[PDB]
Design a protein around this ligand. Structure first.
Ligand code: FAD
Ligand code: FAD
Ligand code: GSH
Ligand code: GSH
Lengths: 461, 461
C-alpha cells in the first residue's frame, strides 16, 4: 500500500484546488481521476457553456446592427464551426491543468477509485491499493434523467452533457426544467435559432430566487421568443418518422388538465437535476453517511462521520458552484496542513450569476428569506427598473431590474438581486461589500460612475 | 429684488442636483441657465459620448462575427443615422430634466447671470435682479483651444463640442492631446473607420494614471490601428485645396527634431484641456477668489472666500466628473438646509472609468502615489495580465490587466487599476469595498464568480 499525506478522489474543481494548495504546504499528494482533469467545470460545464453564451450574445447584437447605423447582417449561423473551436479550447485547458499538477509534484493516478474493507481508510485503483491519513472525496455529480418506468421513452432525450456533443443546431427543441441550467440552455438554443420551448412545472423559472428575478426572468425569456409551457410535464416520449413526439399534460390550477402532443422535436433536453457521484465508491464499506439522494454528509469543516475522510463540492449537495468547491477545498488544505483549525468556508453570502439573456446576478438573501429571518417590520427593500442606455436607439429592448434587501435600523445590506446587461461582471465587487457587512449608507457614500448601469445600485432611494 | 432661499447659477450636473435636494428639504430655489438644462453631461458630454462608444463597440464585435460562426458583415457605417438618433435621445433627456425641475417647484430663470456691485450678494439676469442668502456657482467649463498667436490656423480645428455636431464621418482625423477625452475620441473615430492619428507630447497617454494603465492603454490604441505620434506637437495648421495640412514637430529625446507635414486632414480635434466658465460672472465685483486659470477657489465644504457663496463642479477645477459635481452639490444642500455641518464630499477614492477600447476602471492611489505616501517598504502590489475568455476563439485580441495596490501590514487596498472587456461595469462594487477600507483578505475571503473576468480581482496571489 503506497502511502501519501493526502489522497484526493476526483480531479475536478474541488479536488484539484485542494490537492494543489496542500502540495504548496508540503503535503505529498496524489489525485485519482477516472476521466478528464478539470472535471465538469472544464469539460461539460462552465467553460463550454460560457463560449456558447458568448456566441448567443453575438446573435443578439447582430439583431441591433442596423439600428446602430450598419447594414444588416444576414444570419446563417454555423454550429460546427464554433463547436470545433470550443472543443479545441477545452483541449488546451486539459493540457494546462495536467501541467499544473506536474509542476506542483502531485501524482495523478488514472482510474476509478473505490474504498476497501481495510480497517484504516484505504482505496484501490485498478488492483493497486493507496492510503493516506487524510482522504478527500470530490467526485462531483451527474445529470439526472427520468426513469423509463415513470416516463416511457425518457431515454430518447439528452442531458446537458449530450448538449455539448451536438454537432448540428436542432431545429426544434424542448427543454424540461426550471432551474438555471434549463434557463441557460433555452436561452442559447433560442438565440442561435432553434424553435425553443421551455417546459416548467409551475408558472415561473428559478423559483428559489428572489421573486423579482423569477418573474422578470420568465418575462424576458418570453420576450426573447422562448415558449414557456407552464404547469406542464412530460407524460411520454416517442420516436416518430421525423423527430420525436412529446406528450405532455398541462394542469393549470382552476382548469381541467389538457393533454397535448409536441411533434417533430429534434432535441429533448432534460434539465431537472443533478445526482451525486457516490454509488461506486463502496462508501458502505467504511460506513460513511449519505442522505437518501446519495449525497455525502459533512459538518462545517467538510468532515464526514469517519475520521480522516472529508468531502467537498457537488458530492455534498450544497451550493453547487465551481468557486464553492474550490474555496472549500483550499480552506480544508489550510486546516489540515497549516494547522488552522478555524479554517472553513462560510456558506453565507455566496454570489451567483446565471447566464441568461440578460444575465442575472444574486448574492445574499431574497426578500422572503430576510422577512423570515428579521421579521417584516425590520426589512426594507429598494428597487429600480429601467431600460439600459444601450437600447436608447434600438427597436429590440431588454430591461434592467435591481433590488437591495436591507435589515434592521442601520439598513445592513443582506441581499442584492439584479438582471440586465452587464450584470455578469457587475456582481463581484458588490459581493465583497456585502461580505464585509456594508449598510445602505456605505453604498450611498460611494461616488457613482456615470454613465453605467452599475451606478443605479449606489443611488437607490 | 426677488428673494429666494437658494439661487443656483448653472443648470448642469452640480447645479441641478443641488437645487433639487435643497427643494426636497423645503428651500425655495431657482436655477439660472443660459442654455440647455442637463449642461455638459447631457448635451456634449457623458450621454452623446456613451452612445458613440456603444456604436464603436458594435463595429469591433462585427469584426469577430465570422470567428463566431456567422457570415461576415460588410461594414459601411452610416454616421448620420446614429447622429440623428443620438440627437433625438438628448432631446428626450432635456424634456425630462425640465419636467424634473417643475415637479420639484424649482423656478428656472433663463439667461446669463452676472453678479452686481450690490453689497449683499446679488445677481442680475436680463435686467432683473435676484438675491438669496445662499448662492451656488455651478457654471462648469469649456474646451480649451490654442491661440492663433502661438499656433497659426489653430481655429481651423474643432473641440469635443464640435465633434458632436459632425454630420459625416471624417476620412482622416488627427486628435491632439493625451488625456481621457483625447483617448476616447481617437478610439471612437478609429473604430468607426476614420484613419486616425493621436498626437501626444510625450510617449504615453493618460500619464497621470498608474503606469501599468498608461503603458497598456498606449499599446491597445496602437493594436487597434490608432497612429500614436509621440513627442510631437502642432506648429501650424493651414487650409489646403482638400482638407487641412498640419505641420508638426517631433522631438524625441536623444535625436534631432524633425518637422513633418500631415496633409489631407479632414478633422483636427483639440483635446488639450478644459477652461472654467467664470469670465463673465463679474466675480471681481464681490472679490471672489480664483486661481490664475480662472477656477473659483473653495474650501472642503465648497465655500468660497465670501460668505453665502459656494461653488461646485468643473468650475472649481478638481475631479472633473459628473458624479462628483452631483455628490458635492447634494452634500452642500444637506449642510445648508438640513443643518448637517459635517456634510461635505470626501475627494479620496473617487472612481473613474475611461471609455477606451477596452475600457479602463480606476479608484484610489496609483503605485507611485502609494509609494510616496507610505514608503516603498510599506507598499505591496499584486497584478495579473490575461486574454479574456471571449477571445479564446477570435483572431483579434485584447488583453485584460489588473493591479491592486496595498498599504501597511494588513494590506489595506488603497488602489485598483484595470483595463479590459467589462471593466466599465465591474468597478462600482469594488469602489464601495475600497471606500469601506477593505484589506486584501476581505477580497480574498469573497467567493469568486466563475467564469468572469471580475473573479481575477478576488484571486490575486
Ligand atoms: C451545464 C453546467 C453549467 C454550469 N455552469 C456553472 C457556472 O457558470 N458557474 C459555476 O460556478 N458553476 C457552474 N456549474 C457547476 C460546476 O460545474 C460544479 O459545481 C463543479 O464542477 C463541481 O466540482 P466538483 O469538484 O464538486 O466536481 P466535478 O467538477 O464534477 O469533478 C468530479 C471529478 O471526479 C471524477 N470522479 C468521479 N468519481 C470518481 C472515482 N470514483 N474515481 C476517480 N475519479 C472520479 C470525475 O470524473 C470528475 O472529473 C455548472 C454545471 C453544469 C453541469
Ligand atoms: C466630451 C466629454 C466627456 C465626458 N465624459 C464623462 C464621463 O463619461 N463621466 C463623467 O463623470 N464625466 C464626464 N465628463 C465630465 C462631466 O461632463 C463634467 O464633469 C460635468 O458636466 C460638470 O458639471 P458642472 O455642473 O460642473 O457643469 P456643466 O455640466 O457644464 O454645467 C454648467 C451649466 O451652467 C451654465 N452656465 C454657465 N455660465 C452661466 C451663467 N453665467 N449664467 C447661466 N448659466 C450659465 C452652462 O450653460 C451649463 O449648462 C465629460 C466631459 C466632456 C466634455
Ligand atoms: S473551469 C475549472 C476551474 N477553474 C477556475 O475556476 C479558475 C480558478 C481561479 N483562477 C482561482 O481561484 O485560482 C477549476 O477547476 N480550477 C482549478 C484551480 O485549482 O484553479
Ligand atoms: S447626464 C446628466 C446627469 N445625470 C446623472 O448623472 C444621473 C444621476 C443619478 N441618477 C443620481 O445620482 O440620481 C445629471 O445632471 N444629473 C442630474 C440629477 O439631479 O440627477
Amino acid at each position: 500500500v503506497a502511502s501519501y499525506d493526502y489522497l484526493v478522489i476526483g480531479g475536478g474543481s474541488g479536488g484539484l484546488a485542494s490537492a494543489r494548495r496542500a502540495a504548496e504546504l508540503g503535503a505529498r499528494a496524489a489525485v485519482v481521476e477516472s476521466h478528464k482533469l478539470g472535471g465538469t467545470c472544464v469539460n461539460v460545464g462552465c467553460v463550454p457553456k460560457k463560449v456558447m453564451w458568448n456566441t448567443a450574445v453575438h446573435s443578439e447584437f447582430m439583431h441591433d446592427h442596423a439600428d446602430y447605423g450598419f447594414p444588416s447582417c444576414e444570419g446563417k449561423f454555423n454550429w460546427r464551426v464554433i463547436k470545433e473551436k470550443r472543443d479545441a479550447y477545452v483541449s488546451r485547458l486539459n493540457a494546462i491543468y495536467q501541467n499544473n499538477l506536474t509542476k506542483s509534484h502531485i501524482e495523478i493516478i488514472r482510474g476509478h477509485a473505490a474504498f476497501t474493507s481495510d480497517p484504516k481508510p484505504t482505496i484501490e485503483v485498478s488492483g493497486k491499493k493507496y492510503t493516506a491519513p487524510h482522504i478527500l472525496i470530490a467526485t462531483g455529480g451527474m445529470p439526472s434523467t427520468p426513469h423509463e418506468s415513470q416516463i416511457p421513452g425518457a431515454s430518447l432525450g439528452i442531458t446537458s452533457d449530450g448538449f455539448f456533443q451536438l454537432e448540428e443546431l436542432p431545429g426544434r427543441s424542448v427543454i424540461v426544467g426550471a432551474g438555471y441550467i434549463a434557463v441557460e440552455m433555452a436561452g442559447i438554443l433560442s438565440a442561435l435559432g432553434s424553435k425553443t420551448s421551455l417546459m416548467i412545472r409551475h408558472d415561473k423559472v428559478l423559483r428559489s430566487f428572489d421573486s423579482m428575478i423569477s418573474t422578470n426572468c420568465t418575462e424576458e425569456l418570453e420576450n426573447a421568443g422562448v415558449e414557456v409551457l407552464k404547469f406542464s410535464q412530460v407524460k411520454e416520449v416517442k420516436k416518430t418518422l421525423s423527430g420525436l413526439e412529446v406528450s405532455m399534460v398541462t394542469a393549470v390550477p382552476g382548469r381541467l388538465p389538457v393533454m397535448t402532443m409536441i411533434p417533430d422535436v429534434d432535441c429533448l433536453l432534460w434539465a431537472i437535476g443533478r445526482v451525486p457521484n457516490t454509488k461506486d465508491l463502496s462508501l458502505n464499506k467504511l460506513g460513511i453517511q449519505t442522505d437518501d439522494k446519495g449525497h455525502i454528509i459533512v459538518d462545517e469543516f467538510q468532515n464526514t462521520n469517519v475520521k480522516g475522510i472529508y468531502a467537498v463540492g457537488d458530492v455534498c449537495g450544497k451550493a453547487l458552484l465551481t468557486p464553492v468547491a474550490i474555496a472549500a477545498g483550499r480552506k480544508l488544505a489550510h486546516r489540515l496542513f497549516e494547522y488552522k483549525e478555524d479554517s472553513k468556508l462560510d456558506y453565507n453570502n455566496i454570489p451567483t450569476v446565471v447566464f441568461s439573456h440578460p444575465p442575472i446576478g444574486t448574492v445574499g438573501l431574497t426578500e422572503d428569506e430576510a422577512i423570515h429571518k428579521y421579521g417584516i417590520e425590520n426589512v426594507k427593500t429598494y428597487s429600480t427598473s429601467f431600460t439600459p442606455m444601450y437600447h436608447a436607439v434600438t427597436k429590440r429592448k431588454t430591461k434592467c431590474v435591481m433590488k437591495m434587501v436591507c435589515a434592521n435600523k442601520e439598513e445592513k445590506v443582506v441581499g442584492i438581486h439584479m438582471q440586465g446587461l452587464g450584470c455578469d461582471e457587475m456582481l463581484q465587487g458588490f459581493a465583497v461589500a456585502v461580505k464585509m457587512g456594508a449598510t445602505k449608507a456605505d453604498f450611498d457614500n460611494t461616488v457613482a460612475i456615470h454613465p453605467t448601469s452599475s451606478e443605479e445600485l449606489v443611488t437607490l432611494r
